[PDB]
Amino acid sequence: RRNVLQKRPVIVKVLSTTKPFEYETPEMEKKIMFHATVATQTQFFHVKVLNTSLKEKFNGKKIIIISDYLEYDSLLEVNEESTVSEAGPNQTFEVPNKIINRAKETLKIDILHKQASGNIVYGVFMLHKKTVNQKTTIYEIQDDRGKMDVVGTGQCHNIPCEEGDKLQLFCFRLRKKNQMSKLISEMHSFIQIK
Ligand SMILES: [Br-]
Ligand SMILES: [K+]
Ligand SMILES: [K+]
Ligand SMILES: [K+]
Ligand SMILES: [K+]
Ligand SMILES: [K+]
Ligand SMILES: [K+]
Protein backbone atom coordinates (compact mmCIF):
# COMPACT_ATOMS: atom_id res chain seq x y z
CA ARG A 1 0.00 0.00 0.00
CA ARG A 2 2.60 2.57 -1.29
CA ASN A 3 0.44 5.74 -0.81
CA VAL A 4 -1.78 4.56 2.15
CA LEU A 5 -1.00 6.21 5.53
CA GLN A 6 -0.05 3.44 8.02
CA LYS A 7 -2.25 3.75 11.18
CA ARG A 8 -0.31 1.01 13.09
CA PRO A 9 1.81 3.11 15.50
CA VAL A 10 5.57 2.43 15.58
CA ILE A 11 7.27 3.25 18.93
CA VAL A 12 11.00 4.08 18.46
CA LYS A 13 14.21 5.44 20.02
CA VAL A 14 15.78 8.09 17.68
CA LEU A 15 19.43 6.92 17.13
CA SER A 16 20.45 9.85 14.83
CA THR A 17 19.23 12.80 12.72
CA THR A 18 20.82 14.88 9.94
CA LYS A 19 20.81 18.68 9.80
CA PRO A 20 17.86 20.03 7.78
CA PHE A 21 18.60 20.31 4.06
CA GLU A 22 16.99 21.59 0.90
CA TYR A 23 15.92 18.99 -1.69
CA GLU A 24 14.66 19.48 -5.27
CA THR A 25 11.24 17.95 -6.22
CA PRO A 26 10.94 16.27 -9.66
CA GLU A 27 9.39 19.64 -10.85
CA MET A 28 12.58 21.47 -9.54
CA GLU A 29 10.80 23.15 -6.54
CA LYS A 30 12.82 23.49 -3.26
CA LYS A 31 11.48 21.78 -0.06
CA ILE A 32 13.05 21.10 3.38
CA MET A 33 13.54 17.77 5.21
CA PHE A 34 15.91 15.84 7.47
CA HIS A 35 16.83 12.15 7.75
CA ALA A 36 16.52 10.10 10.94
CA THR A 37 17.50 6.59 12.00
CA VAL A 38 15.20 5.01 14.63
CA ALA A 39 15.01 1.60 16.38
CA THR A 40 12.52 -0.66 18.17
CA GLN A 41 13.82 -3.44 20.47
CA THR A 42 14.02 -5.79 17.37
CA GLN A 43 14.63 -3.61 14.26
CA PHE A 44 15.92 -0.27 12.93
CA PHE A 45 14.38 1.95 10.23
CA HIS A 46 15.67 4.86 8.16
CA VAL A 47 13.07 7.65 8.28
CA LYS A 48 12.54 10.52 5.85
CA VAL A 49 11.13 13.46 7.88
CA LEU A 50 9.58 15.79 5.27
CA ASN A 51 7.86 17.83 8.09
CA THR A 52 10.83 19.81 9.61
CA SER A 53 8.46 21.27 12.28
CA LEU A 54 9.04 17.82 14.00
CA LYS A 55 12.87 18.35 14.46
CA GLU A 56 12.61 18.77 18.30
CA LYS A 57 10.43 15.56 18.61
CA PHE A 58 13.38 13.70 16.89
CA ASN A 59 16.11 15.16 19.26
CA GLY A 60 16.70 11.59 20.68
CA LYS A 61 16.05 12.60 24.35
CA LYS A 62 12.73 10.62 24.27
CA ILE A 63 11.03 7.47 22.85
CA ILE A 64 8.43 8.66 20.26
CA ILE A 65 5.26 7.23 18.68
CA ILE A 66 4.90 7.69 14.88
CA SER A 67 1.56 7.13 13.06
CA ASP A 68 0.13 8.08 9.61
CA TYR A 69 3.54 7.40 7.94
CA LEU A 70 4.18 5.82 4.51
CA GLU A 71 6.03 2.47 4.11
CA TYR A 72 8.15 1.83 0.95
CA ASP A 73 11.85 1.26 -0.01
CA SER A 74 12.16 -0.59 3.42
CA LEU A 75 11.97 2.89 5.11
CA LEU A 76 9.36 5.14 6.82
CA GLU A 77 8.25 8.52 5.41
CA VAL A 78 6.99 11.01 8.07
CA ASN A 79 5.24 13.91 6.25
CA GLU A 80 2.75 16.78 6.89
CA GLU A 81 -0.03 14.12 7.35
CA SER A 82 1.94 12.20 10.07
CA THR A 83 1.64 12.43 13.88
CA VAL A 84 4.69 12.15 16.18
CA SER A 85 4.44 12.41 20.00
CA GLU A 86 6.49 11.44 23.08
CA ALA A 87 5.74 7.89 24.37
CA GLY A 88 3.91 7.67 27.76
CA PRO A 89 5.57 6.82 31.12
CA ASN A 90 4.78 3.04 30.60
CA GLN A 91 5.78 2.88 26.85
CA THR A 92 9.57 3.61 27.22
CA PHE A 93 12.29 0.97 26.53
CA GLU A 94 16.05 0.61 25.83
CA VAL A 95 17.26 -0.72 22.43
CA PRO A 96 19.63 -3.75 22.55
CA ASN A 97 23.14 -2.53 21.52
CA LYS A 98 23.21 -5.26 18.75
CA ILE A 99 20.38 -3.31 16.96
CA ILE A 100 22.09 0.10 17.45
CA ASN A 101 25.33 -1.38 15.93
CA ARG A 102 23.47 -3.19 13.06
CA ALA A 103 21.66 0.12 12.21
CA LYS A 104 25.04 1.89 11.53
CA GLU A 105 26.61 -0.88 9.32
CA THR A 106 27.72 -0.07 5.72
CA LEU A 107 27.80 -2.85 3.06
CA LYS A 108 31.15 -3.56 1.34
CA ILE A 109 31.22 -2.27 -2.28
CA ASP A 110 31.89 -5.80 -3.76
CA ILE A 111 28.52 -6.77 -2.11
CA LEU A 112 26.83 -3.65 -3.63
CA HIS A 113 28.22 -4.65 -7.12
CA LYS A 114 26.33 -8.01 -6.77
CA GLN A 115 23.14 -6.33 -5.35
CA ALA A 116 19.83 -6.17 -7.30
CA SER A 117 18.94 -2.93 -9.15
CA GLY A 118 16.21 -0.97 -7.25
CA ASN A 119 17.61 -1.38 -3.70
CA ILE A 120 18.05 1.67 -1.42
CA VAL A 121 21.55 2.31 0.03
CA TYR A 122 22.62 4.26 3.13
CA GLY A 123 26.27 4.12 4.17
CA VAL A 124 29.60 5.77 5.01
CA PHE A 125 32.27 5.48 2.24
CA MET A 126 35.67 7.06 1.54
CA LEU A 127 35.91 9.47 -1.44
CA HIS A 128 38.55 8.42 -4.06
CA LYS A 129 37.78 11.17 -6.61
CA LYS A 130 35.03 13.69 -7.54
CA THR A 131 34.19 15.04 -11.06
CA VAL A 132 31.74 18.04 -11.17
CA ASN A 133 29.76 18.40 -14.46
CA GLN A 134 26.94 20.82 -15.54
CA LYS A 135 24.17 19.12 -13.45
CA THR A 136 25.81 15.87 -12.20
CA THR A 137 28.71 15.11 -9.85
CA ILE A 138 30.39 11.66 -10.05
CA TYR A 139 31.75 10.78 -6.57
CA GLU A 140 33.96 7.66 -6.86
CA ILE A 141 33.73 5.98 -3.43
CA GLN A 142 36.12 3.20 -2.37
CA ASP A 143 36.63 0.67 0.45
CA ASP A 144 39.19 -2.16 0.84
CA ARG A 145 37.06 -4.38 -1.52
CA GLY A 146 35.89 -2.14 -4.39
CA LYS A 147 35.08 1.21 -5.97
CA MET A 148 31.77 2.48 -7.37
CA ASP A 149 30.29 5.70 -8.81
CA VAL A 150 27.82 7.87 -6.87
CA VAL A 151 25.78 10.04 -9.30
CA GLY A 152 24.72 13.23 -7.44
CA THR A 153 22.07 15.60 -8.89
CA GLY A 154 20.11 18.46 -7.26
CA GLN A 155 21.05 18.81 -3.55
CA CYS A 156 23.60 15.95 -4.18
CA HIS A 157 25.38 17.93 -6.99
CA ASN A 158 28.72 19.70 -6.31
CA ILE A 159 28.98 19.03 -2.53
CA PRO A 160 32.36 20.30 -1.24
CA CYS A 161 34.70 17.39 -0.27
CA GLU A 162 38.32 16.16 -0.80
CA GLU A 163 39.92 12.75 -1.59
CA GLY A 164 40.08 10.83 1.76
CA ASP A 165 36.90 12.48 3.20
CA LYS A 166 34.21 10.00 4.38
CA LEU A 167 30.84 10.63 2.63
CA GLN A 168 27.71 9.69 4.55
CA LEU A 169 25.09 8.73 1.91
CA PHE A 170 21.34 8.79 2.69
CA CYS A 171 18.67 7.06 0.59
CA PHE A 172 20.53 6.41 -2.72
CA ARG A 173 19.09 4.15 -5.48
CA LEU A 174 21.32 1.21 -6.59
CA ARG A 175 21.31 0.87 -10.44
CA LYS A 176 23.44 -1.36 -12.76
CA LYS A 177 26.20 -0.12 -15.14
CA ASN A 178 26.93 -3.28 -17.24
CA GLN A 179 27.15 -5.64 -14.17
CA MET A 180 28.92 -2.93 -12.02
CA SER A 181 26.51 -1.19 -9.56
CA LYS A 182 26.25 2.64 -9.20
CA LEU A 183 24.44 4.71 -6.51
CA ILE A 184 22.01 7.31 -7.99
CA SER A 185 20.76 10.33 -5.99
CA GLU A 186 16.95 10.74 -5.82
CA MET A 187 14.61 13.52 -4.61
CA HIS A 188 15.20 12.73 -0.86
CA SER A 189 18.88 11.69 -1.12
CA PHE A 190 21.59 13.48 0.92
CA ILE A 191 25.42 13.50 1.19
CA GLN A 192 27.06 14.66 4.52
CA ILE A 193 30.90 15.02 4.57
CA LYS A 194 32.03 13.04 7.69
BR1 LIG B 1 4.90 15.43 22.12
K1 LIG C 1 22.33 23.52 9.79
K1 LIG D 1 21.06 22.48 2.67
K1 LIG E 1 20.32 9.75 10.43
K1 LIG F 1 13.78 -2.43 28.16
K1 LIG G 1 26.63 -5.43 21.25
K1 LIG H 1 13.51 10.93 -7.57
From Swiss-Prot:
One cellular component (GO) term of this entry: membrane
GO MF, one example: identical protein binding
Record key words, sorted: Acetylation, Activator, Apoptosis, Autophagy, Cytoplasm, DNA-binding, Immunity, Inflammatory response, Innate immunity, Isopeptide bond, Nucleus, Phosphoprotein, Repeat, Repressor, Transcription, Transcription regulation, Ubl conjugation
Interaction with TP53 C-terminus as annotated region, ranges: 1-194
Domain HIN-200: 1-194
Subcellular location: Nucleus; Cytoplasm
Post-translational modification: Ubiquitinated by human herpes simplex virus 1 (HHV-1) ICP0 protein; leading to degradation by the proteasome.
Any single biological process term in GO: positive regulation of interleukin-1 beta production
Modification sites for N6-acetyllysine: 19
Family, per entry: Belongs to the HIN-200 family.
Name of the protein: Gamma-interferon-inducible protein 16
Organism: Homo sapiens
Classification of source organism: Eukaryota, Metazoa, Chordata, Craniata, Vertebrata
Whole-protein coverage range: 196 to 389 of 785
